[PDB]
Amino acid sequence: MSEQYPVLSGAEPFYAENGPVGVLLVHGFTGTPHSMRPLAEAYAKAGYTVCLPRLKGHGTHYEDMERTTFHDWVASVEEGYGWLKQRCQTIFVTGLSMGGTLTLYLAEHHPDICGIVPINAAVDIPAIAAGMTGGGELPRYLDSIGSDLKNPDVKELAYEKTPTASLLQLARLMAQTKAKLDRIVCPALIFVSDEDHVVPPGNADIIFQGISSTEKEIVRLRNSYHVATLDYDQPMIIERSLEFFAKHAG
Ligand SMILES: [Cl-]
Incomplete structure (x- = not known):
């Protein structure tokens, strides 16, 4: 790590x-x-081997974040997948927002993956930096709006x-990911918060149409905003995923 902060x-x-069944969990961009x-x-607790990596540049300081590329974040997730592959013969991937993008990404590169559970995954964001910069303001930093959590x-x-x-890097990751959806053939369980105010719920439909997965479903989360994994629909996400894992364990 060229991470300068703890x-x-x-x-x-x-x-x-x-x-022998593993779950890789991928956190998001912020x-x-x-x-x-x-x-x-x-x-x-349900019996799964679990890997929840800290993406490079995350969970330290925003300056650390600033020097990382999306290639670094992919590497963090790849190393987590590698850790799991040593230990498990079945692998599922799940992630929130950007972690959902990275989940899609990984499925595109490894169809040995037995299934994916993207949650509010980001694939095409119109408002990149929704009204903090114009195309040519170019501040170094944008102040974050706070958590979209109910x-x-x-x-x-x-x-x-x-x-x-970092936003530039994120837009590039979404492009390379959306472009290659057709590479994904494993079972897909797609969560979407009706009231996501960060990632447009329509991303669910783009993911759903773009993958070549024959087993795929969209599940609507009615009592949660963007950060659904911490929100009121948390137990529903956990219980539906466990059901998903059991039914496709190999
Ligand atoms: Cl967090």
């Missing part, structure tokens, strides 16, 4: 080695493993500023 408390990765930990812990008793540990260099 890991925030609560942002540590999580590994657990249980049975966030840290915190947003995915309740899922990871529930899947580990439940007020939980929180994200995401940075307060987003490097605009």
